[PDB]
Amino acid sequence: QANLMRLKSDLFNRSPMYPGPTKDDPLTVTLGFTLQDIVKVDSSTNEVDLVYWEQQRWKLNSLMWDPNEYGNITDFRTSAADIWTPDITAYESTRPVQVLSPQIAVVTHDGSVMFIPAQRLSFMCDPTGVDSEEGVTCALTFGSWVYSGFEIDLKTDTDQVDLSSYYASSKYEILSATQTRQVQHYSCCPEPYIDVNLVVKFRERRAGNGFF
Amino acid sequence: QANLMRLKSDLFNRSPMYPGPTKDDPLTVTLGFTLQDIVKVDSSTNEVDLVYWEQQRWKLNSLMWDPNEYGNITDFRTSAADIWTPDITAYESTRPVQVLSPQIAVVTHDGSVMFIPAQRLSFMCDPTGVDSEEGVTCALTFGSWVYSGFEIDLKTDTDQVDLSSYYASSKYEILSATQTRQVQHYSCCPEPYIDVNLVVKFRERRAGNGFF
Ligand SMILES: NCCc1c[nH]c2ccc(O)cc12
Ligand SMILES: NCCc1c[nH]c2ccc(O)cc12
Numbered sequence: 001q002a003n004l005m006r007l008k009s010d011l012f013n014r015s016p017m018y019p020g021p022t023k024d025d026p027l028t029v030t031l032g033f034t035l036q037d038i039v040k041v042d043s044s045t046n047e048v049d050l051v052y053w054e055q056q057r058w059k060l061n062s063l064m065w066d067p068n069e070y071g072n073i074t075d076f077r078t079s080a081a082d083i084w085t086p087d088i089t090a091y092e093s094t095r096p097v098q099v100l101s102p103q104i105a106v107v108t109h110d111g112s113v114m115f116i117p118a119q120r121l122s123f124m125c126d127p128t129g130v131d132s133e134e135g136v137t138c139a140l141t142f143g144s145w146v147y148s149g150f151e152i153d154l155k156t157d158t159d160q161v162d163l164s165s166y167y168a169s170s171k172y173e174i175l176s177a178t179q180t181r182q183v184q185h186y187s188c189c190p191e192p193y194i195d196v197n198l199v200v201k202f203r204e205r206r207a208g209n210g211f212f
Numbered sequence: 213q214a215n216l217m218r219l220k221s222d223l224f225n226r227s228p229m230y231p232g233p234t235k236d237d238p239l240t241v242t243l244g245f246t247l248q249d250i251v252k253v254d255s256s257t258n259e260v261d262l263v264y265w266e267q268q269r270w271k272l273n274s275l276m277w278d279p280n281e282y283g284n285i286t287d288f289r290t291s292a293a294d295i296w297t298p299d300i301t302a303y304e305s306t307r308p309v310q311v312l313s314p315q316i317a318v319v320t321h322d323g324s325v326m327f328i329p330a331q332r333l334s335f336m337c338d339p340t341g342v343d344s345e346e347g348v349t350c351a352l353t354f355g356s357w358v359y360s361g362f363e364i365d366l367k368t369d370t371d372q373v374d375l376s377s378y379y380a381s382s383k384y385e386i387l388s389a390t391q392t393r394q395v396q397h398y399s400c401c402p403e404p405y406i407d408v409n410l411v412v413k414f415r416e417r418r419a420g421n422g423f424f
């Protein structure tokens with residue numbers, strides 16, 4: 001309605017977009033994973049396919065407004081394309097990510113943003129032994145592709161992956177799933193890079209729905 | 213044992229073998245099945261492979277002896293080739309039976325015989341639906357190939373198939389298995405023939421070893 005139109009116009013039509021973080025003005029991105037399904041393993045290529053929701057949060061001064069000036073609006077939904085978003089990337093993917101949901105963020109009056117896209121990703125993982133009781137463990141790291149820890153820091157709110165929406169009749173059951181902040185280096189550059197390490201231990205489900 | 217050698221010589225060396233039953237001298241064969249494994253199903257040919265032990269009992273007057281005359285021997289094992297055996301045949305087999313055990317019978321002084329060969333058999337059975345909770349039912353009839361009920365009658369001691377030796381980690385679990393005496397007629401002949409109807413209801417096993 002009228003007040004929201006005013007707010008979007010004011011935030012988006014009169015100043016250049018935020019040019020991303022810098023050493024002088026770094027940004028911390030909070031990451032969290034909701035693992036929905038391990039869809040497929042490929043033992044001939046050592047690729048495993050996950051469906052997850054990637055919760056991203058961050059805060060920009062440039063996205064702040066006074067609710068009093070905008071009919072007491074305290075937050076709004078807007079296309080992710082309307083705002084700056086962090087280049088958080090899976091470091092061991094083997095196919096382009098497939099986006100399974102709209103890409104729309106919620107912006108709150110204090111400048112904070114919540115963005116949770118659903119994604120399917122193939123990544124590097126040797127699934128040998130998945131059909132046993134002990135299962136198998138794979139790891140996948142997520143971090144900025146181009147910014148070091150001098151510009152983008154990462155944080156999780158919990159080290160436990162959210163499994164409350166995990167598909168109960170998946171071919172695979174989850175034995176454990178953790179998300180932990182780490183600090184990695186790459187050959188291109190000397191600077192400290194930050195990642196979140198997603199560690200999933202899983203095995204073929206042989207109990208529950210479809211099992212009698 | 214000298215006494216046993218005498219007995220076998222006296223029984224097997226000095227008279228023509230039993231020419232089989234007749235209308236004037238009919239015979240009753242007791243049958244019982246021990247189902248050990250449902251090994252394989254073939255949904256492209258509608259054949260299923262069973263492993264079972266087939267317990268057969270009958271009694272011949274010509275196999276009697278007085279234990280007093282033979283050092284109190286009341287029974288002995290001997291090769292099934294030494295004695296007459298009934299032509300009990302599976303009527304819906306699709307391959308020759310494969311024998312998995314020695315063929316040796318126990319003969320008792322009253323002329324009674326017990327013979328329990330282990331067998332693998334492929335038979336006519338549509339396995340469609342075996343991977344469901346309801347499973348599938350197949351039936352297999354066993355009886356004399358050439359003797360009518362006027363020469364060979366059949367009997368079971370129980371209508372329950374013995375499942376006490378069924379392979380706990382089979383691909384298939386048994387939902388029920390019965391063995392029931394019936395009467396049948398074939399195009400070739402007007403006389404009633406007797407059979408035992410083996411009816412097995414089963415499904416893919418999804419709870420037990422290999423499952424967690
Ligand atoms: N649809 C589940 C996640 C979800 C709930 N509310 C949202 C708002 C924005 C967003 O990107 C994601 C979400
Ligand atoms: N081996 C288990 C069946 C069995 C026990 N005793 C036997 C004697 C004879 C025979 O044919 C079979 C048996």
